């Protein structure tokens, strides 16, 4: 909760805010400040940072996806996109939009959403098919 990162030039001020999900804080360098940057005081902000030990990093950002193609020949395959919810307290809705360029003829009766090993029926389903 203390011991921020070390930046060599003393910053103008510090701005602490909830930016995406976490209360993160920034050092501010106001370029419209003749104290920070003169006509002959060019500013080279330095940041001491290296990949932190695994017991010191944020876990995962509560949501990520990974799309890939199943099957191995031609003439057939599967567009599958894993999407992860790493929050161990809260289900949340996710709107997935897919565009497939009409030379991978999709079979929408094969659309499965497991989400636990069970089957997850989407709350809202919209599908426009492709005209060659």
């Amino acid at each position: 909760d203390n011991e921020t990162l070390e930046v060599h030039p003393p910053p103008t001020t510090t701005y602490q805010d909830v930016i995406l999900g976490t209360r993160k804080t920034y050092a501010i360098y106001d370029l419209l400040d003749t104290a920070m940057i003169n006509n002959s005081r060019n500013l080279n902000i330095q940041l001491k940072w290296k990949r932190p030990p695994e017991n010191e990093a944020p876990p995962v950002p509560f949501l990520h996806a990974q799309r890939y193609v199943s099957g191995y020949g031609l003439q057939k395959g599967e567009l599958s996109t894993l999407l992860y919810n790493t929050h161990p307290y809260r289900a949340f809705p996710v709107l997935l939009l897919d565009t497939v360029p009409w030379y991978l003829r999709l079979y929408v009766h094969t659309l499965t959403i497991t989400s636990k090993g069970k089957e997850n029926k989407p709350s809202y389903i919209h599908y426009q098919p492709a005209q060659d």
Partner: peptide
């Protein structure tokens, strides 16, 4: 079942 016409596509 989805409500879209079966012929509004190339499949």
């Amino acid at each position: 079942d989805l409500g879209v016409s079966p012929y509004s596509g190339a499949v």
